[PDB]
C-alpha cells in the first residue's frame, strides 16, 4: 500500500459515498471490547470536516 495515509469507503454527511482518507485517526479501545476507531474526514460536498468511526480492524 502507499506509504503515508490510508483511505476508507465512507458515507458523507451530505449523502454521498466515497473513499475518503482520514486526516486524523484515533482509537477508543475498551478492555474486553473491540478497539473502535474514529477518523476525521472532509466532506467533498459541503466542505466540512466530519468525524466518522472506522472499522475496528482498520490499520491505524
Curated annotation (Swiss-Prot):
InterPro entries: Cren7_sf, dsDNA-bd_Cren7
Effect on the protein upon substituting residue 41 to A: Results in a significant protein misfolding, reduced thermostability, reduced ability to mediate DNA compaction and bridging. No effect on DNA binding and constraining DNA into negative supercoils
Alphabetically ordered keywords of this record: Chromosome, Cytoplasm, DNA-binding, Methylation
A family per Pfam: Cren7
Effect ascribed to mutating residue 42 to E: Slightly reduces the melting temperature of the protein. Slightly reduces affinity for calf thymus DNA and poly(dA-dT) oligonucleotides. No significant effect on affinity for poly(dG-dC) oligonucleotide
Superkingdom field: Archaea
List of residues that carry N6-methyllysine: 16
Role summary: A highly abundant chromatin protein, it binds double-stranded DNA without sequence specificity; there is approximately 1 Cren7 molecule for 10-12 bp of DNA. Constrains negative DNA supercoils. Induces DNA compaction and mediates intermolecular DNA bridging. Binding does not require protein methylation. Binds single-stranded DNA weakly. Increases DNA stability against thermal denaturation. Promotes formation of loose nucleoprotein structures with long DNA in the presence of albA proteins.
Designated name of the protein: Chromatin protein Cren7
Origin organism lineage: Archaea, Thermoproteota, Thermoprotei, Sulfolobales, Sulfolobaceae
Amino acid at each position: 500500500m502507499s506509504s503515508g495515509k490510508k483511505p476508507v469507503k465512507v458515507k458523507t454527511p451530505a449523502g454521498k459515498e466515497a473513499e475518503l482518507v482520514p486526516e486524523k485517526v484515533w482509537a477508543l479501545a475498551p478492555k474486553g471490547r473491540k478497539g473502535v476507531k474514529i477518523g476525521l474526514f472532509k466532506d467533498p460536498e459541503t466542505g466540512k470536516y466530519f468525524r466518522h468511526k472506522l472499522p475496528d480492524d482498520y490499520p491505524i
